Amino acid sequence: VYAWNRKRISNCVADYSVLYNLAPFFTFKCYGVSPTKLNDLCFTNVYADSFVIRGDEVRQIAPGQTGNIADYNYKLPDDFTGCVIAWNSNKLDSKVSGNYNYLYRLFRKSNLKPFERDISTEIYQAGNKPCNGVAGFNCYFPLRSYSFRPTYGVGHQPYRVVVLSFELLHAPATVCGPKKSTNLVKNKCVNFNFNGLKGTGVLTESNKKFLPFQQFGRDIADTTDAVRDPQTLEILDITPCSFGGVSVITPGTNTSNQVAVLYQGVNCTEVNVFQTR
Amino acid sequence: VLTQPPSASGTPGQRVTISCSGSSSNIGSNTVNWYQQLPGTAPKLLIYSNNQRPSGVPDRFSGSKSGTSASLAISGLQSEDEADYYCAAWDDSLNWVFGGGTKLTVLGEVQLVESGGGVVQPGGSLRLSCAASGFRFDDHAMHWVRQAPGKGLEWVSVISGDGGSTYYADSVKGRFSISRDDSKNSLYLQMNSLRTEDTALYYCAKDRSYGPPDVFNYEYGMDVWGQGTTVTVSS
Amino acid sequence: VLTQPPSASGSPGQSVTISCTGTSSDFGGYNSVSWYQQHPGKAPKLMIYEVSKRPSGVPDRFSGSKSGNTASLTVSGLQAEDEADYYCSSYAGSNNFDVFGTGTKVTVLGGGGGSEVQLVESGGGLIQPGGSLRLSCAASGFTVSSNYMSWVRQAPGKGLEWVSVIYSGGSTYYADSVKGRFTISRDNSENTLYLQMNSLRAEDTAVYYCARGEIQPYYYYGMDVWGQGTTVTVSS
Amino acid sequence: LPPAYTNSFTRGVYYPDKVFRSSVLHSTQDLFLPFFSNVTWFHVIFDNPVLPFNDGVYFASIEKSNIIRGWIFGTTLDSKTQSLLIVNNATNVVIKVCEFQFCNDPFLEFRVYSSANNCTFEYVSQPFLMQGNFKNLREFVFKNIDGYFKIYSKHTPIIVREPEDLPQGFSALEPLVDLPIGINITRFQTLLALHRSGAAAYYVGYLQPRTFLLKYNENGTITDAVDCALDPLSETKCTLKSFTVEKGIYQTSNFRVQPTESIVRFPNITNLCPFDEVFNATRFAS
């Protein structure tokens, strides 16, 4: 709690749905947004801050609250848009040999600034005396270790709590989330959304030699003709859907009522039957 | 509020799909809990946290949390699966909203017993007691989920294993006092301002978490139920 | 609510070995059970804080091992003339007051802190029911603005209970008895630290005790110094 | 040093976007290097000046093996603001936007800086970005936009052993890195691999907002480019989508002589106010 990591993670496909099956978590509360809509929001960088507290101290981790740990080791203002994901770790962090490794900084002068890490080890000086280093009646160790033991009950066990602080500064967002895909359909007028490029057409196979850096592709006068497959390298062709003018041939409403229908721009295989120019 | 089919149907051999629709304030921020109750006997936990299942529940049940609604799946149902299915979720407004029940009918070891019912004079009431036998009452929470005869279930109050903060429902707030003691496994619930609309069973529900189900939004559940008494004030 | 024996007088100083049952757990986290010797008149004095390592005092009271689910403080062989009340502290859960126990009469016979830092109070003689009375414990020694202090009151017959807890600079937690009607306000950071009554509800008649250290999360603090209390004597 | 200047020929026409085009003429409007311009002739035979980065520069390098390596792009080159220290180490490229100010001097072992602050990006690019009388020319077009620090590059193995000067021939640049880090950059600092234990000379141009008509090959590459404001012939070749102008007279854009001075003449000042007599008296009022 006095020395917590501040890993600045970015440039990844943060799939929050996977976190629901990695480890048997016991807390998945998120204050900012919903996890269903979180997978569709881009972010710049996530601040991963992890620490270990007891079971009765998990409630103190809130956007604004007082306590022995909420204002002395880690404080969250009223703007935390992440989560408070946490889980019990009483399976490998509790042995009967003396757990004098952790601490919680029982002694302090005042409330620390939220989202701040104070890595200090000086002797706590309770005023009215210059303590150049002494331990008696005026200046004591401001750190005190826990008493985690395996033969205990829930509530005073080591609980690993990790928060994911989100921020959106004046910089383009890097991490957005997981993106899915669908099966490719060839020789059929369907819709396509290849990397934002939306439209409809018949995805066919072409023989164009695209450049290794080019992704999209246009025509002589402002019309997309072929793009690059977002998957493995494949050269396709985007031709518009089936369209044409319909003309009806009628010999006149004086002898009969039989008419002929002519579809323009079709090879009789895309709608007796005759194929003309 | 949770939307659930009142009385669905189904045929043997194939599978059905029971759904539970809810807003993002209760389901979108927490986990749905599925409970199964046979007609006549005490209820029992079926699916908790929508991902894991108890040791007694076989692999014949499965649930998902796709979106803001829960979906139940029973691959290969039979006559033994003819029971009532209730959906439960903890809302962010310090309350526990329950479902209505799904009549999925197809026509082809620690005891948690409690007592303290009986008909009493309207206006006033008596205390509600409960007991157990060596189940580590300090490291477990207790819930009050009463069930009216023929009607559904609803959450009344909650007590944490630590014994500190407690929460009540929207109708039983103020006139109810729940607390524990340093004695053996027990639970005392005092009722006040009796309005005669309390004909239920008041199940002494056992849980597995330690704190109140407001900070632990992924481990909160409900263990095996207990045989409750039938209190009928009837004014 | 804890479990303590009403009285203990048989076999004086040979098989007394008083304790405090009613825990049914492993004392929560940090196993620190303190024992206070509440003597009539002056303020009580600390006897032992942990299960061992007794502080500077009488050496005939030690071996406070936690037998089963209670701390059995070995008091046999101490003396044969004492008139006081022993109280134990437990239930160290987060935000849980009333850590003291009931009055245990440990009189083996029945019939037969002063200049350390400071000891001052307000002297609330004939307190009018209501209003706002301030009680201070100005200490010219230890800092009255950096150490963790608390307020514990006791009434005739009834035992002690946690009434107020105040941390270094940013915590003003109140007990469950007042439930909000009590507002703690710190005085100047270099003069003293006083309290506030805030329209008492006729239950604040008990005498107050301003301790320089915590009760349940008690730390060594060099020495445990208390202060004599004053009678409220409400006229509601 | 008295930095000389050379005549920059047709070189530095990069691809504005990634769009396949075959045998067409696309008239683009973006930041490009004006043809027949002046580019400084800083020789690295010691030299390390500070160059102003207004909207984009055209960096070149005619190093032999490892003479010119690294870039010290930044705004103030101080510890308060961030900077850029993209260097070319052993078969790798380290790209960090950390705010490492300096240690003693931009020279290079990581002897360029010695400090420790908070960083924002650690995109370590694994693929590196970099015959007797066969030198190697490496040009780099640095262009910064509101949310992307785009960097172009192209390696051309020149053959002619003439005195050090820009060769004759069109050569586009291919984008390789698209760092989306957003930071204002206004100063350019260069450095060379000292390694003490006419070599080379880098050319640094300046981009300007102009119009260029691009000719794409049947394969999908640009064969040449023609400016639009360089001579009376270029405007005719830009107003018509054809590099082969027929014989005749063509009407180009219109010209307008902009004014220089501006006079504001008002009527004469008269009919003054009696305030001069009001504020000057003996008995005013009660």
Residue numbers in the entry:
A (entry chain C): 350 to 620, 641 to 646
B (entry chain I): 3 to 110, 125 to 251
C (entry chain H): 3 to 114, 124 to 247
D (entry chain B): 24 to 68, 79 to 141, 156 to 177, 181 to 247, 261 to 349
Provide excerpts from the study.
We determined the cryo-EM structure of the prefusion stabilized SARS-CoV-2 Omicron S ectodomain trimer in complex with the bispecific antibody GW01-16L9 (FD01) in its native full-length IgG form, revealing 6 states of the complex with resolutions ranging from 3.47 Å to 6.11 Å. The epitope of 16L9 mostly overlaps with the RBM, while GW01 binds outside of the RBM. From different states of the Omicron S–FD01 complex, we revealed that two scFvs of the bispecific antibody synergistically bind to two distinct epitopes and induce the RBD-down conformation into 3-RBD-up conformation. Thus, although either 16L9 or GW01 alone could not bind Omicron S tightly, the GW01-16L9 bispecific antibody could bind Omicron S collaboratively with the help of each other.
Finally, three FD01s cross-link two trimers in state 5, forming a trimer dimer conformation (state 6). Finally, three pairs of Fc regions from FD01s cross-link two trimers and form a trimer dimer (State 6). Cryo-electron microscopy (cryo-EM) structure study showed six dynamic states of the Omicron spike (S) trimer upon bispecific antibody binding, including a novel trimer dimer conformation, within which RBDs were all in “up” conformations. This trimer dimer is critical for inhibiting ACE2 binding and explains the superiority of the bispecific antibody. The trimer dimer conformation might induce the aggregation of virions and contribute to the neutralization ability of FD01.
